[PDB]
């Protein structure tokens, strides 16, 4: 072991869905539109 | 007043990762960086509840990794916008936060498993070999060579933190600066070069 | 305004790999690069939802490999176009993304298997030989020589990441620049050389 | 083993179909045409 | 406009290997190169679907080998044509692709088998000899000498990749250039030497 | 073994039929003619 | 052990609730308002 | 062995028939004549 706390408390991470760059651009475009509705 | 206000230090804007990378979380990774540009999806939020709209702008960055915190430390390179017939391309000092903490959170991956397994087995064979060569009346060389080769091949790998291209993050302008269009930049330059003594 | 706009930093265009290579994913591979040019198949997509058509243009690159991330890191060399009677040949700074991450994803191949197998067997023979030479009353030299030779021959190989010539990727213009025809380039040069004092 | 995660999450790779350079050029030409339909 | 257009970078033309070679795929092979010239059999295919006919022209190259990728890396030396009464002989920067990947694919051949077999047997004799010299009451020198000689003779050989003279490949003009006849070249030279101040 | 993938995916190689230089030149001459038919 | 006192007396620490930067900004905005009521 | 391919594919070599230099010159003279027939 390590002798200190072994884990974080957030328990949150990013993802990887093999999203293409164009798909990511389109997703960001659609997000901002809804937010600025 | 100019077209754009003064973006105060510490101002942050929500964004979406458009291009990811594997961060190269090695001891030498701070110099071997990878591009991980993103796109601005919300209004720049600034001090005293004041906000500016710089949406659809592209922000180019470069990132390395950290295995202690298990995060991708990202350094902002530039920001570019195409507003009206106005072109913006400016170098900015900033960073990226994920869920309120500096850097982006990801896992640590190592593709050393097979070679490390081979080295282990090679010297397990070595130890049995030594405990067979131990036999006095009142495989070791090959295992050692293969162990050396496979350890040398395994130390070539270094851990990486993969960041995808579909995550929401925040861009922080650590140092305050003035937005400028390329036209404004050229106007400032030509005037400076004129040297109106 | 000139014929072509200002391509903002971080702008990306879909492309198809026309020429592949084996990337030479060795520790010294960053200097030993290979050409992996591609062809532009979509509209340059730029900041703020603005797009330009530079289709059929050729982009010459050079690539090396990485075994930790298992990817081909590709550096853009040049871009060339033949539009109308207008010739474009410009050095550009950019990179290549595959499925939203920096670099192109491929497998790691090693053609060292046979020589590594031979070295192993040579010293397995060595260990049995030592455990036969161990016999006191109350093959090893040949195996060692062959092991040395075969290990030396096996360390010559380095891993490579093969990239085919039928994959769809994205080209990212990391630094903003101005498109220029060779005629425009010569006009800028001759005028500069004139030195209109 | 290695002691960290052993695999990626994308599970995606390129291909190699022995495609000639001319065949690749033609394939790219045809792709762009359909996209700009 | 001149007789010939501007051949853009990344333009490729189908060709047939007329002269092959064994590429010398050693660590020092990059300096010990061999001539492997070929002949152009198709129209130069250039950016934006534009093509020029330079057929029957000879392209002289020089090639070395690579055992990791198992391919002959070929560097273009020159291109020569005899069109009309016009003579073309120009140094060009380019390379060769085979089936969409950089370099030409071939096998790796080693003619070290007999000498390596002899060294092995020599020291197998050595190990039996040591395990016969091991005999206390309560051949090795010759084998060692022959092993040393035969290992020294075997390390002289290096692997080669043989490329035949009947394969179809592609020549890539990595750097854009202007085709010029020897007459045009002399016209440019004499004018430059004139120094019309 | 090597511990990584051992083989390529193209499974394609050149040939060697002891073709003379003149024979290769003639073969290339005939190829181009058919292509430019 | 260490041979001196092993623990502090505050027995207090911060937290980590995976709070986003925007959420933290909003929380701070709301705090100050109540305090300046 | 060597651990790679042991032989070539051409399976062709030159010869040595103890031909004198004058004999070789005459043979070359006769070859060219037939070719330029």
Beta-carbon separation of D24 and C18 below 8 A: yes
φ, ψ of residue C184 to 5 degrees: the values are -60, -40
| Structural contact between residues C182 and E47, judged by C-beta atoms closer than 8 angstroms | no
CA A27 vs CA A19, A22, B167, E129: distances in Å: 10, 9, 10, 76
The pair of structure tokens assigned to E128 is 């039996």
Measured in residues, chain G has a length of 37
The pair of structure tokens assigned to C74 is 């590709």
Bridge partners (DSSP) of residue B97 are B102, B103
Residue in chain E nearest F30 by alpha carbon: E41
The pair of structure tokens assigned to B39 is 């796109």
Residue in chain A nearest D8 by alpha carbon: A16
Residues of E in contact with D18 (CB under 8 A): 99-100
Helix (H, G, I), strand (E, B), or coil: what is residue C182?
helix
Closest CA to B159 of G34, E110, D8, G25: D8
Q: With an 8 Å Cβ cutoff, is G2 touching chain A?
A: no
* Residue of H3, H5, H10, H13 to mutate, testing the E interface (most E Cβ within 10 Å of its Cβ): H5
Measured in residues, chain F has a length of 37
Measured in residues, chain B has a length of 197
User: DSSP code of E3?
Assistant: S
Pairing state of beta strands E58-66 and E71-83?
Answer: antiparallel
Q: How many CB atoms lie within 10 A of CB C176?
A: 23
DSSP per-residue codes, B49-79? TEEE---S-EEEEEEEEETTTTEEEEEEEEE
Beta-carbon separation of C105 and D14 below 8 A: yes
**Chain D contact partners (≥3 CB pairs within 8 A):** A, B, C, E, F
Closest CA to C95 of B29, B36, B72, B22: B36
Helix (H, G, I), strand (E, B), or coil: what is residue C121?
helix
How many alpha carbons lie under 13 Å from residue E54 in its C-beta half-sphere? 30
Beta-carbon separation of G22 and B99 below 8 A: no
- Centroid of chain to Cα E89: 21
Closest CA to C115 of H3, B194, E161, E42: H3
Q: Where are the beta strands (DSSP E) in chain C?
A: 6-7, 11-17, 21-22, 34-35, 38-40, 44-46, 50-52, 58-66, 71-83, 86-91, 95-98, 101-102, 104-105, 162-163, 168-173, 177-178
H 12-31 → F contacts, CB under 8 A: 12
Q: What residues have CB less than 8 Å from C170, skipping those under 6 apart?
A: A20, A21, A22, C12, C13, C14, C15, C96, C97, C98
How many alpha carbons lie under 13 Å from residue E171 in its C-beta half-sphere? 32
Residue B76: is it exposed, middle or buried by C-beta count within 10 angstroms (0-12/13-18/19+)?
A: buried
Beta-carbon separation of G18 and A10 below 8 A: yes
Helix (H, G, I), strand (E, B), or coil: what is residue B89?
strand
Query: How far is E156 from C79, CA to CA, in rounded Å?
Result: 45
Angle at C189 between CA C184 and CA C192, to 5 degrees: 125
Dmax (CA) of chain H: 51
Measured in residues, chain D has a length of 37
Q: Is C114 left (phi over 0), alpha (psi -120 to 50) or beta?
A: alpha
Q: How far is D17 from chain F (nearest CA, A)?
A: 6
Query: How far is C122 from E117, CA to CA, in rounded Å?
Result: 12
Using the CB atoms, write b or e for C99-129: b if 16+ within 10 Å.
bbbbbbbbbbbbbbbbbbbbbbbbbbbbbbb
Query: How far is C90 from B20, CA to CA, in rounded Å?
Result: 27
Give the residue ranges of DSSP H helices in chain B: 113-133, 141-154, 182-194
* Residue of G2, G16, G24 to mutate, testing the A interface (most A Cβ within 10 Å of its Cβ): G16
Q: What residues have CB less than 8 Å from A27, skipping those under 6 apart?
A: A19, B16, B166
Query: How far is D29 from E161, CA to CA, in rounded Å?
Result: 35
Residue C185: is it exposed, middle or buried by C-beta count within 10 angstroms (0-12/13-18/19+)?
A: middle
The pair of structure tokens assigned to C90 is 């410009």
H-helix or E-strand spanning residue E160: none
| Structural contact between residues E60 and E35, judged by C-beta atoms closer than 8 angstroms | yes
Q: How far is B114 from chain F (nearest CA, A)?
A: 6
Bridge partners (DSSP) of residue B96 are B171
Q: What residues have CB less than 8 Å from G35, skipping those under 6 apart?
A: none
User: DSSP code of F9?
Assistant: S
| Crossing angle of the two packed helices E113-133 and C113-133, in degrees rounded to 10 | 20
Residue in chain C nearest F5 by alpha carbon: C109
Residue E1: is it exposed, middle or buried by C-beta count within 10 angstroms (0-12/13-18/19+)?
A: exposed
Beta-carbon separation of D1 and B117 below 8 A: yes
Beta-carbon separation of C166 and D29 below 8 A: no
Give the residues after which the backbone of chain F is interrupted, taking a C-to-next-N distance over 2.5 angstroms as a break.
none
Q: Do chains D and F touch (3 or more CB pairs under 8 A)?
A: yes
Measured in residues, chain H has a length of 37
Query: How far is E129 from E123, CA to CA, in rounded Å?
Result: 9
Q: Which residue has the tokens 């397995």?
A: C124
Beta-carbon separation of A14 and B42 below 8 A: no
Pairing state of beta strands B11-17 and B168-173?
Answer: antiparallel
Q: Do chains H and E touch (3 or more CB pairs under 8 A)?
A: yes
Q: What residues have CB less than 8 Å from B168, skipping those under 6 apart?
A: A31, B14, B15, B16, B17, B41
Q: Is E17 left (phi over 0), alpha (psi -120 to 50) or beta?
A: beta
| Structural contact between residues B23 and B160, judged by C-beta atoms closer than 8 angstroms | yes
Beta-carbon separation of A13 and B164 below 8 A: no
Cα end-to-end distance, chain D, whole Å: 51
| Structural contact between residues C38 and C63, judged by C-beta atoms closer than 8 angstroms | no
Q: How many CB atoms lie within 10 A of CB G19?
A: 16
Residues of C in contact with H4 (CB under 8 A): 114
* Residue of C14, C99, C170 to mutate, testing the A interface (most A Cβ within 10 Å of its Cβ): C99
The pair of structure tokens assigned to C117 is 């197998």
Query: How far is C142 from E148, CA to CA, in rounded Å?
Result: 10
Task: State the Rg of chain F over Cα.
Answer: 18
Residue in chain F nearest H9 by alpha carbon: F16
Q: How far is A23 from chain C (nearest CA, A)?
A: 9
Resolution to one decimal, Å:
3.0
The pair of structure tokens assigned to B88 is 């913006």
Q: With an 8 Å Cβ cutoff, is A1 touching chain D?
A: no
Residue in chain C nearest D8 by alpha carbon: C69
Beta-carbon separation of E100 and D18 below 8 A: yes
Closest CA to C81 of C113, C40, C45: C40
Query: How far is E103 from C75, CA to CA, in rounded Å?
Result: 19
**Chain H contact partners (≥3 CB pairs within 8 A):** C, E, F
Q: Do chains F and H touch (3 or more CB pairs under 8 A)?
A: yes
Task: Report the residue from C68, C120, C140 with minimal CB separation from B158.
Answer: C68
Residue B19: is it exposed, middle or buried by C-beta count within 10 angstroms (0-12/13-18/19+)?
A: buried
H-helix or E-strand spanning residue E21: strand E21-22
| Crossing angle of the two packed helices B113-133 and C113-133, in degrees rounded to 10 | 20
Task: Report the residue from B20, B143, B149 with minimal CB separation from C101.
Answer: B20
| Structural contact between residues B21 and C102, judged by C-beta atoms closer than 8 angstroms | yes
Query: How far is C22 from C35, CA to CA, in rounded Å?
Result: 10
Beta-carbon separation of D29 and E12 below 8 A: no
Helix (H, G, I), strand (E, B), or coil: what is residue E126?
helix
| Crossing angle of the two packed helices B141-154 and C141-154, in degrees rounded to 10 | 10
Q: Do chains D and G touch (3 or more CB pairs under 8 A)?
A: no
Beta-carbon separation of B99 and A35 below 8 A: no
Angle at H29 between CA H28 and CA H33, to 5 degrees: 110
Helix (H, G, I), strand (E, B), or coil: what is residue E120?
helix
Instruction: List residues of B whose CB lies inside 8 A of any A CB.
Output: 15-20, 39-43, 55-56, 70, 98-99, 101, 104-107, 162-168
Bridge partners (DSSP) of residue B63 are B34, B74
Q: What residues have CB less than 8 Å from H25, skipping those under 6 apart?
A: none
Closest CA to E96 of H28, B178, D21, D32: D21
CA A19 vs CA A12, B167, C99, D7, D9: distances in Å: 20, 10, 6, 18, 12
Helix (H, G, I), strand (E, B), or coil: what is residue B109?
strand
CA C53 vs CA B160, C81, C168: distances in Å: 36, 11, 18
Positive or negative torsion for Cα E84, E87, E89, E92: negative
The pair of structure tokens assigned to B174 is 């650590």
* Residue of F7, F24, F25 to mutate, testing the E interface (most E Cβ within 10 Å of its Cβ): F24
Query: How far is C176 from C94, CA to CA, in rounded Å?
Result: 9
Task: Report the residue from E109, E116, E164 with minimal CB separation from H5.
Answer: E109
Query: How far is C112 from G23, CA to CA, in rounded Å?
Result: 55
Bridge partners (DSSP) of residue B39 are B16, B58
The pair of structure tokens assigned to C52 is 């330009």
**Chain G contact partners (≥3 CB pairs within 8 A):** A, B
Q: How was this structure determined?
A: cryo-EM
| Structural contact between residues G18 and A14, judged by C-beta atoms closer than 8 angstroms | no
Beta-carbon separation of C45 and A22 below 8 A: yes
The pair of structure tokens assigned to C20 is 């592949």
DSSP per-residue codes, F2-35? -SSB-S-S-----------HHHHHHHHHHHHHHH
| Structural contact between residues C75 and C172, judged by C-beta atoms closer than 8 angstroms | no
Residue E2: is it exposed, middle or buried by C-beta count within 10 angstroms (0-12/13-18/19+)?
A: exposed
Positive or negative torsion for Cα F18, F23, F25, F30: negative
Cα end-to-end distance, chain E, whole Å: 26
φ, ψ of residue B151 to 5 degrees: the values are -65, -40
How many alpha carbons lie under 13 Å from residue B133 in its C-beta half-sphere? 16
Query: How far is B74 from B30, CA to CA, in rounded Å?
Result: 10
The pair of structure tokens assigned to H17 is 């028939």
Query: How far is E37 from G32, CA to CA, in rounded Å?
Result: 80
Using the CB atoms, write b or e for F10-36: b if 16+ within 10 Å.
beeebebeebeeeebbebbeebbeeee
B 59-118 → C contacts, CB under 8 A: 59-60, 77-78, 80-83, 87-89, 110-111
| Structural contact between residues C34 and C24, judged by C-beta atoms closer than 8 angstroms | yes
Residues of F in contact with B111 (CB under 8 A): none
Helix (H, G, I), strand (E, B), or coil: what is residue B36?
coil
CB pairs under 8 A between A and B: 64
Query: How far is E166 from F22, CA to CA, in rounded Å?
Result: 11
**Chain A contact partners (≥3 CB pairs within 8 A):** B, C, D, G
Beta-carbon separation of E107 and H5 below 8 A: yes
Q: What residues have CB less than 8 Å from F13, skipping those under 6 apart?
A: E105, E106, E107
Query: How far is B39 from B54, CA to CA, in rounded Å?
Result: 10
Query: How far is B18 from E35, CA to CA, in rounded Å?
Result: 47
The pair of structure tokens assigned to D2 is 């290695």
Query: How far is B161 from C69, CA to CA, in rounded Å?
Result: 9
The pair of structure tokens assigned to A26 is 């389109």
CA G21 vs CA B164, E164, E181: distances in Å: 20, 65, 67
CB pairs under 8 A between A and C: 21
The pair of structure tokens assigned to B117 is 């397994």
Q: How many CB atoms lie within 10 A of CB E19?
A: 18
| Structural contact between residues E99 and D19, judged by C-beta atoms closer than 8 angstroms | yes
Query: How far is C78 from F3, CA to CA, in rounded Å?
Result: 37
Q: With an 8 Å Cβ cutoff, is H11 touching chain F?
A: yes
| Structural contact between residues E48 and C53, judged by C-beta atoms closer than 8 angstroms | no
Dmax (CA) of chain C: 104
Residues of A in contact with B18 (CB under 8 A): 21, 24-25, 28
């Amino acid at each position: 072991c390590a002798g200190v706390k072994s884990s974080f408390d957030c328990d949150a991470t990013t993802s990887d869905t093999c999203m293409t760059m164009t798909k990511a651009n389109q997703l960001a475009r659609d997000k901002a539109a809804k937010q600025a509705g | 007043k100019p077209r754009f206000p003064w973006i105060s230090s510490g101002s942050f804007v929500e964004a979406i990762v458009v291009e990811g990378a594997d961060a190269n979380a090695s001891v030498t990774g701070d110099k071997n960086t990878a591009p991980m540009q993103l796109r601005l999806t919300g209004k720049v939020q600034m001090p005293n509840d004041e906000e500016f709209d710089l949406t659809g702008c592209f922000v180019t960055l470069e990132a390395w990794g950290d295995v202690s915190s298990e995060r991708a430390i990202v350094r902002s390179r530039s920001i570019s916008c195409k507003l009206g017939d106005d072109d913006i391309d400016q170098k900015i000092a900033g960073h990226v936060s994920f869920m309120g903490k500096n850097g982006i959170k990801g896992e640590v991956v190592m593709r050393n498993g097979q070679i490390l397994l081979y080295a282990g087995g090679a010297g397990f064979l070595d130890g049995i070999g030594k405990g067979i060569e131990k036999a006095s009346s009142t495989v070791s060389s090959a295992a050692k060579t293969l162990s050396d080769y496979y350890i040398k091949r395994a130390e070539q790998y270094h851990p990486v933190i993969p960041i995808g291209a579909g995550n929401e993050v925040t861009l922080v302008f650590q140092d305050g600066f003035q937005l400028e269009t390329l036209e404004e930049a050229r106007a400032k330059a030509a005037a400076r070069k004129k040297q109106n003594q």
